[PDB]
Ligand binder design. Structure first.
Ligand code: MIB
Length: 118
């Protein structure tokens, strides 16, 4: 019929698809606040604000073997990464910058892969 691009294709393609998005999002210069692991009190205001701390170092870990195969599961965590930084980081900081730049890249990429869910 026509072209709308707004629906994943089976868990097989979607699986590696999330693995590709992470490969780019993580490889993106604006991913160091999530790619590498963070300390425990190195973040200005952590634990007592982030209900579910998350980072890219954990996604690729499970996504590698078999975990983020769904569209909402991956989007939830990944989206939790961009907001988590934006959460404990003030309005003026490099953490938010790279998090807002990569987050923009993420939404666009998924917007084209008919992903996104919650
Ligand atoms: C994106 C996220 O959920 C958590 C990021 C950080 C957690 N900690 C403890 C940090 C310390 C420094 C910088 C970033 C973080």
């Amino acid at each position: 019929g026509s072209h709308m691009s707004k629906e994943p294709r089976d868990p097989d393609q979607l699986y590696s698809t999330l693995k590709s998005i992470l490969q780019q999002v993580k490889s993106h210069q604006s991913a160091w606040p999530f790619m590498e692991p963070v300390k425990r009190t190195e973040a200005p205001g952590y634990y007592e604000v982030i209900r579910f701390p998350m980072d890219l170092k954990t996604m690729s870990e499970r996504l590698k073997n078999r975990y983020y195969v769904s569209k909402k599961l991956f989007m939830a965590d990944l989206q939790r990464v961009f907001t988590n930084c934006k959460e404990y980081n003030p309005p003026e900081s490099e953490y938010y910058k790279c998090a807002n730049i990569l987050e923009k890249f993420f939404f666009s990429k998924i917007k084209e892969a008919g992903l996104i869910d919650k």
